[PDB]
Amino acid sequence: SMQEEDTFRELRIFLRNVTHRLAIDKRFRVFTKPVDPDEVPDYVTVIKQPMDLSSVISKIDLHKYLTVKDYLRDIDLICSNALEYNPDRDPGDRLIRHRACALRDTAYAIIKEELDEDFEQLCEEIQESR
Ligand SMILES: CC(=O)c1nc(NC(=O)[C@H]2CNCCN2)sc1-c1cc(O)cc(O)c1
Numbered sequence: 746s747m748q749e750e751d752t753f754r755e756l757r758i759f760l761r762n763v764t765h766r767l768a769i770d771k772r773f774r775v776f777t778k779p780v781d782p783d784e785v786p787d788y789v790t791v792i793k794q795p796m797d798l799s800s801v802i803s804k805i806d807l808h809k810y811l812t813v814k815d816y817l818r819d820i821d822l823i824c825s826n827a828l829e830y831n832p833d834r835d836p837g838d839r840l841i842r843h844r845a846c847a848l849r850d851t852a853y854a855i856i857k858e859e860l861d862e863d864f865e866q867l868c869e870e871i872q873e874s875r
Contacts, residue, residue, distance in 0.1 A: 752868060752871060753811060753871070755864075756810070757810070760805050760810060760813075761805055763816075763852060764802055766855065767851065767852060773848050773851075775844065776798050776827070776844075776848055777797060777799060778797055780792075792826050792829065796826060798823070811871070812865065812868045813856060813860060814869075817852065820848070820853075823849075824848060827841050827845035
């Protein structure tokens with residue numbers, strides 16, 4: 746309905762604002778663009794489902810997220826992809842894993858603090874009816 750497209754538009758506005766706040770954080774610069782095969786050739790090997798914050802913005806604009814859970818699944822994908830590509834003890838890996846955990850925890854904490862629980866529930870129930 747008009748009432749439901751309003752809800753989904755508000756969700757999109759919210760998710761764009763969260764994602765922008767993640768994307769401008771210096772810690773998360775490695776997660777802002779897709780991995781370049783030129784700069785990192787063996788990534789396309791290990792990571793079957795690449796994800797990054799620019800792709801999140803495009804999916805928002807494509808109406809691909811109808812719920813916050815849907816969005817958080819892709820945030821979790823950015824994080825788990827980074828843990829898988831960086832399993833070793835050496836400091837390059839440990840630094841990426843730390844930022845990846847911080848990206849995930851930051852996204853969850855912004856949503857917990859600023860997203861109304863009844864709004865996310867409305868989003869869920871509209872989606873379940875489709
Ligand atoms: C996002 C990600 O998971 C990622 N992981 C890396 N790991 C390493 O470089 C590890 C590999 N093991 C040996 C020690 N170095 S680099 C990197 C990345 C970094 C950027 O500046 C841009 C970008 O698009 C991706």
